[PDB]
Design a binder for this molecule. Structure first.
Ligand SMILES: Nc1ncnc2c1ncn2[C@@H]1O[C@H](COP(=O)(O)OP(=O)(O)OP(O)(O)=S)[C@@H](O)[C@H]1O
Ligand SMILES: Nc1ncnc2c1ncn2[C@@H]1O[C@H](COP(=O)(O)OP(=O)(O)OP(O)(O)=S)[C@@H](O)[C@H]1O
Ligand SMILES: Nc1ncnc2c1ncn2[C@@H]1O[C@H](COP(=O)(O)OP(=O)(O)OP(O)(O)=S)[C@@H](O)[C@H]1O
Ligand SMILES: Nc1ncnc2c1ncn2[C@@H]1O[C@H](COP(=O)(O)OP(=O)(O)O)[C@@H](O)[C@H]1O
Ligand SMILES: [Mg+2]
Ligand SMILES: [Mg+2]
Ligand SMILES: [Mg+2]
Lengths: 340, 343, 327, 319, 255, 250
DNA sequence: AGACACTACGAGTACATA
DNA sequence: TTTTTTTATGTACTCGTAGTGTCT
């Protein structure tokens, strides 16, 4: 029962092993969980709309809230979790969601009311609401507006623009902030201490730096570095280079080579070096990010050059965000920034 | 042949020793393994390394696999039938064999295998190899986003792809990212020496092997296949000046580039459209066609930097157009017309 | 109990006297229902303006507490096809009332999601049965309704709620709840609403929960801004000044520290800078063209994700290159 | 509040062809036809709210007298009008025997004929051709292109046009005289301006203004009825300076609650129906408006997108 | 708590069959006097009102007035899984929750315990049929069903006319026109075939055929349909059960 | 050359339609004793078995035991396109299967089928120990299954303290049928046999049982054998066995 | 008691879309 | 002067096995 779940958690990846179970385990998203804790004593939970970057803890926050609200017994009877792996057309929204909202709340047991608040409403959460069509979303309007006495709606998405304006107006918007080094270093150090991850001084802060506001990717990189350090068995500490080599980050010397090829050189040698660089598999997104960081943070270029480099990097990132060919886009970017 | 000589374990790999050691690190503790995404150039050997890693996570029976047929029903009376490569320890799914109906197959089959528990009389989870994750539309990726996290104790995904550009950010975050850099010409020539020593090839000079590497651009699948092809024309004895056998579509693209750089007119644009139709009708993707045509146009020495810059700019623009469109010829002809107008 | 409903639902108007903002429409509707001449209504307006509340309070005033039975209320949540029209709406219009004597009311809420065939079948139901029943169509977009159906109803445009109405409703809530609000905090609340009562009520509930006290203190602008995660005008103008005057590295560092110390979003900063630069009196409109185009492009790119640092640098460079022409 | 009164559109609905202030030519044609008899198959097309349904109803009534109940078959878009209905009920009505005066015929009125399926329209051909001596068909639609050419070939085509300001003003004056309502010239002018050739909309706005304010004045009319949507959009697009168009979009459209989708759709329609600028300029403007609409539909609909669209339109107009 | 053990199984089955495809969402109310339920049609045209006292039940125990709402589709699905020889038992806990339908066999230990999850319907329980009626009549079920489903083929509307000792059902349509005139008469050797009629004022009002075709479905319960008509009053079609009554309130058409 | 004669074609028709929804290809092995068949589902979640001995055939001649691999498409078409005496004919190297329909009529028709070669892997069948073994009439179990399948999509079997419980927790509600062992004298068909050693509780898919209960007409009683970690055993007396694997845990 | 006209709920096939 | 194209909900038509009230 409990011991089996503990062992299964202990034999699961660190992303799911250290998933926040309570509203206190969340470190940086304090503004939303403060309201979620204060409404836990009351009974006026409004319709909520979680939105933000991926890996900020929206699903974890709503799961911890539903747990702290209903207990592990009513957690399976007073919830309706609809993810993107299910059909969510107009038909589903009209039949299943509306029938569950029209249902009466399940009666709590004697042990439930003794330890948990047991609010008089249930929760219908809709994870990954970006994939929901606009008509199926508009169908939810009166469904959530008339049955608010017995059910509460929780939408979860990454792009708040994909949800129609009436639905965004009906729900209170909770924006989850990116988990950078400052507000997630405590959680990363806790995860490293619980797993005896022997690292150096500036490793963890570097990991989140590569994460760019993503604690899931940081925990995964930490687990990978820990596995790579335990396989060796040398007993030393993990370094920033050993972390950045498996995170897909281009080394500094290879980036300096690219900068030298762009500064001095014509189309031919630039194209040849790009063809040689694309042989070693690097994600063009990370290369564009490193080039942007280098060009903007360097105090050696003119403001007129910096505006143009920023616009060109923006255009290249926007074109890469559509699944384009990495080689063509990278070559075009380097050529355009080579021409002054 | 590329099939007769292929590594079956991690200790049988002959290049990227750092990647082999990282795979051994990742397979040391096999049950505490997150989802993986192998990305890199096409033909590096990531599909072989994934199977070699599974051979370390499980017994040697991972390679004894069978192809079964599975059927699905869409929202209408249309039926889909696709072949699944399954093994007593893992299964392989390639949703690149259909259109926009990959999300249904993904969700249904993955929920089925997640609820399904492994059988005995052959560890605890059953691996899924998603081949060519780039063809997965955003809807199927969004559907898999929550399936990756809900069932993490029975289903571990190993997604093989060539470029993480079409992969969404949530899926990228939900799995480890492993890059497979293409092997250098030295390792390719070393593998070629071994395979020609085993296949009894007669070489007057060894440098030709290096040239094969310089003709494959790091691709081992192209290098070995081209070596075996040019070994059939020279009758199992490669000469010091044996010609390099290029695929038919590459020669067609080169002739199209020649036609572009020689004549720039609408009458030539009609012939260009005809050649593009003949290329597309014979199972050749349009993104590869555009990439190779642009790279061949840049290699033309008659043009200058001003022409090549505009060529690569229009190439990127029409690459975005083709990634946002479906009628590939509608973008290919536009790119060709813009290139003709540039020159 | 009503004490469990959210503030948006708990404070739903039950009578026509609790619907603020709309005075020209409410008075004319009251006169319609008093003199008896009630035509087919078409309430067109943005979300959260009070159309559904208005029509519900109107049906309550017309039929009494028996509203839920003498009125046929259909919405997008219910199946509304051509056969649904043909059967349900025609049978409701053709027969008489079961509980009292009087005309019937068909409230087609959110009728902008109906099929064209359904509207084509309903446009002759409205014209044929017009002596014993009425039709009220609620809409947010007037382009989804056929012109034939659009010409049969009297159109009432629900304007966005002005300052006075939202302030009156906020005062009513502050009387109903043990809560105090600062004047500047109230002004900032009015500013981030765009005439949406739902947003105001939701963020008011959120800031009351944020207080973390027995509500013996006042809600200031800091509480509001930390609740909705919106940037403050101070940081907004500081970032704009650093972009317009300081160097590239200084502006980049300022934007980074401002957006990372408070956890602000780049889209909110973009919207705020757009709102601030709208009052800027500039030279030849080429700078305004470049600014608007580049900012809209960056917003559309943000609406799909990507690198936030690259987009911030793009915003800085776009603003700088746009103001470089105003010389 | 126990009972309501009939609206002025239904109460003052014309019951004779003389009370119709529409197209004088077609109205006099229908009057002469009803006076002499021998009404042929007809298809009446036009815009909503100009007197098409009332016209055919008055025609059938004055042509059939007391036999209207048993000689007229009325079928609207609200009733089933598939192939099965045309096969069974319409054919049974056309074959039904009825002793009529020696100058009349049974009339089959089909309201909203542009919504009938292709199968029903095809089956109606021989149904109307084999019984053309005792059954006549009158279609009332808004788009003649939705009715197949074989059906149009067997009937007359009456295209109703927009009602000029004179006709709507005369009808409004008649309604005022029959209602004894205090009005003003500027109020009636504003009503005609906001009606846009729609008689039904004009009468509805007049009744609304009367029952809401009592006096028909331009102030009250503009207070209860906003300015026409396409005209403000046209004035915004035809602005000479970017600042003027931005101010118009901000104050008139955005500050009054008009959604971005409605704004971009009205801009597209106005640019399509525009005639002041050349064809190429209109094509580029439509291209930019569609580029903006593609972002509005994806949920990125804000004021910044419309401002950028106006800026791009002005840049195009900047030679 | 609530314990309602029926004597048989097919009784409730026929009770729900009476208005199976007529209404959707019902809200039963169990009190000390019996179960009472009123349900409005989807188009808000007719109201079904059923009342079964403590006579039709084998055992009845109700502590406090309980309200259980449910959809008729799920209730029919649950009731179809029960054998006609079983014994039905409705059970409800202290607070209103999923009603327990228990099927208990009389010879073998077969405990079929289904749990039907309730709905949350707005309990707008009104007080109806407390108004004086202008005309009352009663006639056999088979005759009414025959007349209804014979006139429904000629038209979609049926005009009922009650004149001085004269009942008239008229159906005016497109392919034809029918009229049935039954006269009040009371028989002594067959007291169930009598057609009683007490009229105070002449009544003339029309109804739809699609609704009468569903009202006549309740003729499987009783054999004497009572019809109460009046100007501006819901037409009362009452079937008299052995313990309670099932009454349909139909709304007349607008002439 | 194999010659088999069923007195009635209806028996073979019912046999083939009993499982014509769970498989597409099927191997029939033919030996001296009778005919035996096993087939694996396309999803490899359920296996179907079949054994018909010389008791059912009016005439049987089988010189050499051979494996006939037939598809469901053509055989189903032949069985559905056409009580009468059915005769199965095969020759040396049986490239075709002939099905003659022949007591008061002399009309005959048949369409030939070309066979395939499927690698029917041989997995041993062991009679291990079981924590619970029960037998109940086929019609009652079929009724229970098609009654509980309307509520949920997963049927829970709970065998404890001489009581069996078929539970189904669905969306619209929850059903639970509790049954006690019963043996009847006047009707030997309506008897409930059960023996246990450990209370067991497993969950199976309802879509699989919805097709398993299609074999309710082959025999009158069905056996359920449930254990801790081994898959459930559904036994039908011709002897045929179904191995159903349950859901892991939650 | 049973056969077969009447019938109404369900799977399949297309056909548009401003 | 001529052939084809992925998908998504609403609409209309058709055959059609099926469930039940009725007549030789
Ligand atoms: N605020 C947080 N505190 C602690 N751990 C976190 C936090 N956010 C994310 N994590 C970790 O990241 C894992 C993933 O959390 P999720 O809630 O699924 O992320 P997400 O916001 O849902 O991203 P998506 O699903 O792609 S939009 C959790 O199981 C934690 O291990
Ligand atoms: N004029 C108003 N006066 C007071 N409260 C209002 C007003 N308008 C909106 N509200 C509040 O906002 C809630 C929602 O109002 P609704 O009428 O449902 O919005 P809406 O105008 O119908 O727009 P939709 O539903 O998104 S199309 C009400 O329950 C009130 O709490
Ligand atoms: N020429 C007219 N003279 C007087 N009243 C008119 C005239 N045209 C329209 N009306 C009024 O408008 C009402 C409705 O007119 P209709 O004939 O129904 O409009 P229409 O021309 O048929 O266009 P539709 O029905 O929307 S396709 C009538 O009842 C009259 O009150
Ligand atoms: N380490 C290696 N040593 C020798 N050959 C290899 C190695 N890795 C891959 N190959 C060759 O690559 C071929 C398969 O390429 P594949 O993995 O399908 O390309 P991709 O990486 O695009 O999937 C095999 O035939 C095998 O011989
Ligand atoms: Mg999530
Ligand atoms: Mg509303
Ligand atoms: Mg009309």
């Amino acid at each position: 029962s409990k011991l089996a779940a503990e062992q299964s958690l202990a034999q699961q990846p660190w992303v799911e092993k250290y998933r926040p179970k309570n509203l206190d385990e969340v470190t940086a998203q304090d503004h939303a969980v403060t309201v979620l804790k204060k409404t836990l004593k009351s009974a006026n939970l409004p319709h909520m709309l979680f939105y933000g970057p991926p890996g900020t803890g929206k699903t974890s926050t709503i799961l911890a809230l539903t747990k702290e609200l209903y207990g592990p017994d009513l957690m399976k009877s007073r919830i309706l979790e609809l993810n993107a792996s299910d059909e969510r057309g107009i038909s589903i929204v009209r039949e299943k969601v509306k029938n569950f909202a029209r249902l009466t709340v399940s009666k709590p047991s004697k042990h439930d009311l003794e330890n948990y608040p047991c609010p008089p409403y249930k929760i219908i959460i809709l994870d990954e609401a970006d994939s929901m069509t606009a008509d199926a979303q508009s169908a939810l309007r009166r469904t959530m507006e008339t049955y608010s006495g017995v059910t509460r709606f929780c939408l979860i998405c990454n792009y708040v623009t994909r949800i129609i304006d009436p639905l965004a107006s009906r729900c209170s918007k909770f924006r989850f902030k990116a988990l950078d080094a400052s507000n997630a270093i405590d959680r990363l150090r806790f995860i490293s201490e619980q797993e005896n991850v022997k690292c150096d001084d500036g490793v963890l802060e570097r990991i989140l730096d590569i994460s760019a506001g993503d604690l899931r990717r940081g925990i995964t990189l930490l687990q990978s570095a820990s596995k790579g350090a335990q396989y060796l068995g040398d007993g030393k500490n993990i370094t920033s280079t050993q972390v950045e080599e498996l995170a897909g980050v281009v080394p500094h010397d290879i980036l300096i080579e690219i900068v030298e090829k762009v500064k001095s050189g014509d189309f031919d040698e630039i194209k040849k070096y790009v063809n040689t660089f694309m042989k070693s598999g690097w994600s063009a997104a990370s290369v564009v990010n490193q080039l942007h960081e280098y060009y903007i943070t360097n105090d050696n270029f003119d403001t007129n050059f910096k505006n143009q480099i920023s616009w060109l990097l923006f255009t290249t990132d926007s074109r890469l965000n559509n699944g384009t060919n990495e080689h063509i886009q990278l070559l075009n970017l380097l050529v355009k920034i080579s021409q002054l | 042949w590329v099939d007769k000589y292929r590594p079956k374990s991690l200790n049988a790999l002959s290049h990227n020793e750092e990647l082999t050691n990282f795979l051994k690190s990742l397979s040391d503790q096999p049950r505490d393994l997150p989802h993986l995404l192998l990305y890199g150039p096409n033909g590096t050997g990531k599909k072989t390394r994934c199977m070699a890693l599974l051979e370390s996570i499980f017994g040697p029976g991972v390679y004894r696999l069978k192809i079964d047929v599975r059927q699905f029903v869409t929202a209408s009376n249309r039926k889909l039938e696709l072949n699944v490569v399954s093994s007593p320890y893992h299964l392989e799914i390639t949703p690149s064999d259909m259109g926009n109906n990959d999300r249904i197959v993904i969700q249904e089959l993955l929920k089925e295998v997640a609820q399904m528990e492994q059988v005995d009389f052959q560890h605890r989870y059953k691996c899924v190899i998603i081949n060519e994750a780039n063809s997965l539309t955003k809807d199927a990726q969004a559907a898999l986003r929550r399936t990756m996290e809900k069932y993490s104790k029975n289903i571990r995904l190993i997604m093989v792809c060539d470029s993480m550009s079409p992969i969404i950010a949530p899926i990228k975050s939900r799995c480890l990212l492993i890059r497979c850099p293409a092997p250098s010409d030295s390792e390719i020539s070393t593998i070629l020496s071994d395979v020609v020593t085993n296949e009894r090839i007669q070489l007057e000079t060894k440098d030709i092997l290096k040239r094969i590497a310089q003709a494959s651009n790091g691709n081992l699948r192209v290098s070995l296949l081209m070596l075996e092809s040019m070994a059939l024309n020279n009758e199992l004895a490669l000469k010091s000046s044996s010609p390099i056998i290029k695929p038919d579509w590459i020669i067609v693209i080169h002739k199209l580039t020649r036609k572009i750089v020689k004549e720039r007119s609408v009458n030539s644009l009609i012939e260009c459209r005809a050649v593009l139709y003949d290329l597309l009708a014979h199972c050749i993707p349009a993104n590869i066609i555009l990439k190779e045509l642009t790279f061949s146009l840049l290699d033309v020495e008659t043009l200058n930097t001003t022409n090549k810059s505009s060529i690569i700019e229009y190439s990127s623009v029409f690459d975005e157009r083709l990634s946002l469109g479906n009628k590939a010829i509608f973008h290919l002809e536009g790119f060709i017309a813009k290139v003709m107008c540039c020159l | 109990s009503k004490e469990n409903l959210p503030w948006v639902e708990k404070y739903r108007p039950e009578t026509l006297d609790e619907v603020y903002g709309q005075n020209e429409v409410i008075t004319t509707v009251r006169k319609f229902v008093d003199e008896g001449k009630l035509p087919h209504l078409l309430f067109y307006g943005p979300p959260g303006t009070g159309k559904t509340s208005t029509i519900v309070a109107l049906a309550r005033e017309i039929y009494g507490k028996n509203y839920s039975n003498m009125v046929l209320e259909l919405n997008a949540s219910d199946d509304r096809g051509i056969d649904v029209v043909r059967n349900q709406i025609k049978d409701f219009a053709s027969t008489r009332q079961i509980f009292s004597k009087g005309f019937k009311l068909i409230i087609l809420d959110e009728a902008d999601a109906m099929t064209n065939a359904a509207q084509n079948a309903l446009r002759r139901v409205i014209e044929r049965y017009t002596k014993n029943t009425r039709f009220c169509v609620l809409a947010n977009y007037a382009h989804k309704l056929t012109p034939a159906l659009l010409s049969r109803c009297t159109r009432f445009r629900f304007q966005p709620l002005p300052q006075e109405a939202i302030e009156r409703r906020i005062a009513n809530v502050l009387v109903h709840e043990k809560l105090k609000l600062s004047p500047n905090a109230e002004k900032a609340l009015i500013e981030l609403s765009n005439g949406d009562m739902r947003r105001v009520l939701n963020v008011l509930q959120s800031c009351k929960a944020t207080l973390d006290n027995p509500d013996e203190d006042e809600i200031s602008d800091d509480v509001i801004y930390e609740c909705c995660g919106a940037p403050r005008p101070s940081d907004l103008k500081a970032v704009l000044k650093s972009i317009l005057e300081d160097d590239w590295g200084t502006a980049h560092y300022t934007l980074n520290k401002v957006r990372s110390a408070k956890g602000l979003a780049l889209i909110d900063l973009i919207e705020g800078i757009v709102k601030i630069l709208e009052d800027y009196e500039l030279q030849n409109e080429e700078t305004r063209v470049h600014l608007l185009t580049k900012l809209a492009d960056i917003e559309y790119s943000i609406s799909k994700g990507g690198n936030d640092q690259i987009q911030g640098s793009a915003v800085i460079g776009a603003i700088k290159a746009s103001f470089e022409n105003e010389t | 509040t126990l009972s309501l009164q009939l609206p002025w559109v239904e109460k003052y609905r014309p019951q004779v062809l003389s009370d119709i202030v529409g197209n004088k030519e077609t109205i006099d044609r229908l009057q002469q036809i009803a006076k002499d008899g021998n009404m042929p198959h007809m298809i009446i097309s036009g815009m909503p709210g100009i007197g098409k349904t009332t016209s055919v109803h008055c025609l059938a009534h004055e042509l059939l007298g007391r036999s209207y109940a048993d000689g007229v078959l009325e079928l609207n878009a609200s009733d089933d009008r598939g192939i099965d209905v045309v096969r069974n009920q319409i054919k049974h009505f056309a074959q039904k025997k009825l002793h009529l005066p020696p100058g009349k015929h049974k009339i089959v009125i089909l309201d909203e004929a542009d919504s009938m399926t292709a199968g029903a329209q095809q089956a109606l051909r021989r149904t109307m051709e084999l019984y053309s001596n005792s059954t006549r068909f009158a279609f009332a639609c808004n788009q003649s292109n939705k009715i197949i050419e074989p059906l149009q070939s067997r009937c007359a085509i009456l295209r109703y046009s927009k009602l000029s300001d004179e006709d709507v003003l005369k009808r409004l004056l008649q309604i005022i005289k029959l209602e004894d309502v205090k009005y003003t010239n500027d109020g009636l002018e504003a009503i005609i301006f906001t009606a846009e050739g729609d008689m039904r909309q004009a009468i509805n706005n007049l009744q609304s203004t009367v029952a809401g304010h009592g006096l028909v004045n331009a102030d009250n009319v503009f207070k209860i009825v906003d300015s026409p949507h396409p005209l403000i959009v046209k004035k915004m697009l035809l602005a000479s300076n970017l600042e003027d168009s931005i101010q118009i979009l901000r104050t008139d459209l955005w500050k009054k609650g008009y959604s971005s989708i409605d704004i971009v759709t009205t801009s597209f329609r106005v640019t399509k129906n525009l005639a002041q600028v050349k064809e190429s300029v209109r094509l580029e403007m439509i291209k930019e408006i569609g580029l903006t609409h593609m972002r509005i539909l994806e949920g990125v609909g804000t004021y910044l997108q419309l401002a950028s669209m106006l800026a791009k339109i002005h840049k195009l107009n900047n030679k | 708590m609530l314990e309602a053990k029926f004597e048989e199984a097919s009784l409730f089955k026929r009770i729900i069959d009476g208005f199976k495809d007529c209404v959707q969402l019902v809200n039963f109310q169990c009190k000390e006097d019996g179960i009472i339920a009123q349900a409005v049609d989807d188009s808000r045209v007719l109201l079904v009102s059923l009342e079964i006292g403590v006579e039709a039940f084998q055992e009845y125990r109700c502590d406090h007035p309980v309200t259980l709402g449910m959809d008729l589709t799920s209730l029919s699905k649950i009731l179809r899984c029960g054998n006609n020889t079983d014994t039905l038992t409705l059970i409800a806990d202290n607070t209103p929750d999923s009603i327990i339908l228990l099927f208990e066999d009389t010879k073998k230990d077969r405990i079929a315990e289904y749990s039907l999850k309730l709905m949350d319907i707005d309990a707008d329980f009104l007080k109806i049929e407390e108004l004086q009626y202008d005309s009352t009549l009663s006639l056999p079920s088979s005759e009414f069903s025959k007349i209804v489903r014979d006139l429904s083929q000629l038209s979609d509307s049926i005009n009922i006319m009650i004149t001085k000792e004269t009942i008239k059902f008229v159906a005016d349509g497109d392919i034809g026109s029918g009229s049935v005139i039954i006269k009040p008469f009371v028989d002594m050797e067959h007291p169930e075939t009598s057609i009683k009629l007490e009229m105070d004022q002449p009544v003339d009002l029309t109804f739809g055929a699609k609704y009468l075709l569903d009202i006549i479905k309740g003729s499987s319960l009783s054999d004497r349909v009572g019809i109460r008509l009046s100007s501006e009053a819901p037409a009362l079609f009452q079937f008299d059960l052995k313990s309670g009554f099932l009454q349909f309130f139909l709304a007349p058409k607008f002439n």
